[PDB]
Structure 1
Amino acid sequence: KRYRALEGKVDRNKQYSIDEAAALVKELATAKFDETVEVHFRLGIDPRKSDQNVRGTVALPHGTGRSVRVAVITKGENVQAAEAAGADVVGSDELIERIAGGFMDFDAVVATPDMMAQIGQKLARLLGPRGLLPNPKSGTVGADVAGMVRGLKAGRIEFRNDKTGVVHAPIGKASFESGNLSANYQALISALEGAKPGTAKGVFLRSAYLTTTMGPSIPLALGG
């Protein structure tokens, strides 16, 4: 079991907001190693339509407890600008062979301006149906693979949505403070309640709950 001294401090009948929960959230965690805590939401608009699936990014403020993933595919004076910085598996068009021979655990498979045709003529029968490619309106097109890859650097990207009514983007790590468990939670209601395409319902924010490596749940209030 080992449920006590962590569920006892918890009542699913009260509320712990933005400046009271983030200081009683690293608590609700006393398990083994490091212990991050989730932050739940509910896009329960009309979840069985293809015009209520969130297909947009999030950009965490500070630095998480990770690094950066951007599988660049460049050539020339674009090789010493993505290898001498902090990207991932950077080189030339050899990356086609590194993203077609069985290794697609990468993220933004970047490219060069004149060399989108390399990701478009060979890996359009492969990478085509991934939607993980550099578009001229998405995030990383042109010669902005240094400062808008700093949107894949200065922000753990990711983008997903489901079919029941549960949506919960995480904060990052509890390796911070209580003004940084709610300053990374100031990038969750600052990057997930911009999801109203064309049809909606009444009242989006219904409540809020929690999650760790041993729970439980003190309902996060919503307001000022």
Structure 2
Amino acid sequence: KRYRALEGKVDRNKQYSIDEAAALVKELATAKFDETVEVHFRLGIDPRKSDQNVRGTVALPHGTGRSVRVAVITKGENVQAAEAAGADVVGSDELIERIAGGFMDFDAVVATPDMMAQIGQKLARLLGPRGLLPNPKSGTVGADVAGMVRGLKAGRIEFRNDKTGVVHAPIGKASFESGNLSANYQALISALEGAKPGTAKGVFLRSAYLTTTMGPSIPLALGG
């Protein structure tokens, strides 16, 4: 159990908005190690059609307690511009053997302009239908594997949708401040309520709830 002195201070009938929940989120987590509290939203527009899934990304503010994940595949003057920085698993053309041998937990596997065919002639039989490839309009295309892979540096990417009616993206950690849990919360209603491709209904935001390693939830308010 262990449900008091952290839920006794919790009532699921009042409010705790932006400048208030931020000074009461790192609190409701007197459990074990570092404890992050989720930020819940509800995509319940119409959860059973192909044009209601948010097929886009989000970019976290500062620097989380994590790192940077990008398995580059390059050759030439792109190896010293991709190993002397801090990406992930970089070498040469043998990165088709590191992503077809027995491990695919890597992220945005980059390439080279004239070497896109390395992830299109050799890894379009396996890595083809994975939706994690470099193309000339989305993530990282061209010789931009040092400037806009910084969108994979300063911002936890993440792209997912479901079949029920719950969508909750993380802020990172609570190992910061009471003005930085609401600074990470200025990029979640700033990069997640913009999914309107084909058809939708009326009124989007309704309320908000929470989640930890021992809860709980004080319904977050909304406004200016």
Name the TM-score, length of structure 2 as normaliser: 0.99
Aligned-residue offset at 1:175 = 0.5
Aligned to 2:68: 68
2:118 is paired with a residue whose SS is helix
Deviations 1:137-185 (A, max 9, x none): 0110000101110000011111001111111111000001011101011
Aligned-residue offset at 1:81 = 0.6
- Provide the rounded CA distance (Å) in 1 between the counterparts of 2:187 and 2:91: 33
1:129 is paired with a residue whose SS is helix
Aligned-residue offset at 1:32 = 1.2
Matched, 1:88 2:88: yes
> Taking every aligned residue pair, what percent have the same amino acid on both sides?
100
Matched, 1:222 2:209: no
Superposed, 1:31-70 pairs within 5 Å as 31-70=31-70
- Provide the rounded CA distance (Å) in 1 between the counterparts of 2:205 and 2:90: 42
Aligned-residue offset at 1:211 = 0.6
Q: What runs of 5+ residues in structure 2 fail to find an aligned partner?
A: none
Deviations 1:102-158 (A, max 9, x none): 110000000011100011001001000001000100110000101110000011111
Aligned-residue offset at 1:79 = 0.1
2:96 is paired with a residue whose SS is helix
Deviations 1:54-109 (A, max 9, x none): 11011111001100000000001000011000100011110000000011000000
- Provide the rounded CA distance (Å) in 2 between the counterparts of 1:68 and 1:214: 29
Give the count of matched residue pairs.
Answer: 224
Superposed, 1:71-220 pairs within 5 Å as 71-220=71-220
Q: What runs of 5+ residues in structure 1 fail to find an aligned partner?
A: none
- Provide the rounded CA distance (Å) in 2 between the counterparts of 1:198 and 1:129: 24
- Provide the rounded CA distance (Å) in 2 between the counterparts of 1:148 and 1:220: 34
Moved beyond 6 Å, runs of 4+: none
- Provide the rounded CA distance (Å) in 1 between the counterparts of 2:48 and 2:179: 37
1:19 is paired with a residue whose SS is helix
Deviations 1:10-36 (A, max 9, x none): 000000001111111101001011011
- Provide the rounded CA distance (Å) in 2 between the counterparts of 1:190 and 1:39: 13
- Provide the rounded CA distance (Å) in 2 between the counterparts of 1:163 and 1:32: 32
Aligned-residue offset at 1:202 = 1.2
- Provide the rounded CA distance (Å) in 1 between the counterparts of 2:40 and 2:197: 21
- Provide the rounded CA distance (Å) in 2 between the counterparts of 1:44 and 1:204: 9
- Provide the rounded CA distance (Å) in 2 between the counterparts of 1:145 and 1:58: 19
Taking only aligned residues, the RMSD between alpha carbons, in angstroms, comes to: 0.6
Aligned-residue offset at 1:198 = 1.4
- Provide the rounded CA distance (Å) in 1 between the counterparts of 2:197 and 2:217: 31
- Provide the rounded CA distance (Å) in 2 between the counterparts of 1:193 and 1:53: 12
